[PDB]
């Protein structure tokens, strides 16, 4: 009498194309403890999705589920997480570094187990970019096209961090609230607006189809996207055309800006309405596991977050996994953990007015009362 475990991941995690990593650990977990009675059934399901589909009723939702800690705080608010202890805490402590393991602490307490760290970088065809040309956003518009997705929130902040623009102070104090305000948000917006008005830029879609689409085409030379579509640009592309690049300056006012990403992770939690929470806290730790990490790795190229596989030679060598440590080294903020709801949903809006023909669009002569207005939207959204 077999008890069922029901686990939620990524279509690319389920898919035999790609060695269905996921379903690969849960046998493998099953077959390493033989004193567990299980069979697995899976739902498919975007880590940037997990939110809303778990605290929309936890128990009606996967046991075990892979998700992006951003969602952190929503999930517990919702019990839809349970604390970890034990062992598994300890190896979240134990083989991440500090930044890795507070991606998943929340009041001095372990909720999930990371599997990788969690940031977007630069793909660019290398026929057109050279690597110097990608060091800075202006110098590429000069030479060929270049997109990037407004209207997502986990991407446009990395403009307004540039010109130090805040969210909760250093991303942990939420007495400090949002600040895009001022002329140092306008000056920003009129670099976007700027950006939408270069005939070489071409505005990507939420989820990045559009970007990819464009690769393949030649429409579109840059990228800005995540380890998730590797494989994708490679086909794409071709792979020895692949670029892979940490992020580029933008030239506000005649000051080279740095763009800075989020860095998060994205990490397996358990359900609490999970009738066997012995198994279900085991699977986790087993998912995040050094091994399962090389095998989503081996099978998919998704680079490892544990820091002893960073010295395996082939990790060491990938250039996505090398983009994504340069972004975290010299390119990035720490995803606040502290909810940023009203952020999201402001964002993209705010993102799609910069549109040519938009309602309300955004432009140079509007750009402050514009700044102003999504920075009120933001902290009215913490009242
Ligand atoms: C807006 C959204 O931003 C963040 O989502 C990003 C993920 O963290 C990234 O990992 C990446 O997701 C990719 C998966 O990693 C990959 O395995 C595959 O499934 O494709 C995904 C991309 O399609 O990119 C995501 C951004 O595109 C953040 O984690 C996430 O929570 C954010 N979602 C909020 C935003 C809205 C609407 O504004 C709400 O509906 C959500 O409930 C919020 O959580």
New binding site residues.
């Given amino acids: 009498g077999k008890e069922t475990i029901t686990v939620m991941?990524?279509?690319?995690?389920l898919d035999d194309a790609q060695g269905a990593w996921l379903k690969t650990e849960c046998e493998a977990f099953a077959k390493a403890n033989p004193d567990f009675n299980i069979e697995f059934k899976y739902v498919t399901?975007?880590?940037?999705?997990?939110?809303?589909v778990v605290?929309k009723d936890p128990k009606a939702a996967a046991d075990v589920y892979?998700?992006?800690?951003?969602?952190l705080e929503?999930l517990i608010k919702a019990n839809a997480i349970a604390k970890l202890g034990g062992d598994t805490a300890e190896y979240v402590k134990s083989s991440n570094s500090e930044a890795m393991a507070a991606t998943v602490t929340y009041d001095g307490d372990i909720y999930a187990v990371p599997y990788?760290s969690?940031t977007?970088f630069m793909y660019y065809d290398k026929r057109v970019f050279s690597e110097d040309d990608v060091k800075s956003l202006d110098t590429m518009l000069t030479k060929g096209k270049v997109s990037f997705?407004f209207d997502?929130?986990?991407?446009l902040n990395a403009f307004y961090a540039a010109n130090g623009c805040t969210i909760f102070g250093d991303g942990t104090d939420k007495a400090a609230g949002y600040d895009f305000s001022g002329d140092k948000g306008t000056a920003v917006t009129n670099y976007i607006v700027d950006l939408f008005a270069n005939p070489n830029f071409v505005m990507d879609n939420?989820?990045?189809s559009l970007g990819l689409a464009g690769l393949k085409d030649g429409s579109i030379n840059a990228y800005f996207?995540?380890?998730?579509?590797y494989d994708k640009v490679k086909e794409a592309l071709g792979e020895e055309n692949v670029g892979v690049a940490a992020l580029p300056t933008i030239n506000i006012g005649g000051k080279d800006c740095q763009l800075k990403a989020?860095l998060?992770s994205?990490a397996i939690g358990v359900n609490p309405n999970c009738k066997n929470q012995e198994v279900a806290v085991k699977l986790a730790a087993f998912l995040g596991s050094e091994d399962a990490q090389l095998a989503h790795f081996k099978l998919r190229g998704?680079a490892p977050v544990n820091k002893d596989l960073a010295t395996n030679e082939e990790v060491a060598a990938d250039p996505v996994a090398a983009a994504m440590a340069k972004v975290s080294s010299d390119c990035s903020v720490a995803?606040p953990i502290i909810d940023?709801?009203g952020y999201?949903?402001a964002?993209?809006p705010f993102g799609d007015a910069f549109q040519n023909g938009a309602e309300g669009q955004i432009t140079k002569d509007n750009a402050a009362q514009k700044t102003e207005d999504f920075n009120t939207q933001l902290n009215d959204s913490l009242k």
């Fill in positions: 991941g990524p279509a690319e995690d399901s975007s880590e940037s999705d997990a939110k809303d605290t892979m998700f992006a800690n951003d969602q929503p990788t969690n977007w997705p997502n929130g986990w991407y939420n989820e990045g996207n995540g380890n998730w579509n989020f998060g994205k998704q995803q940023m709801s999201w949903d964002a993209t």
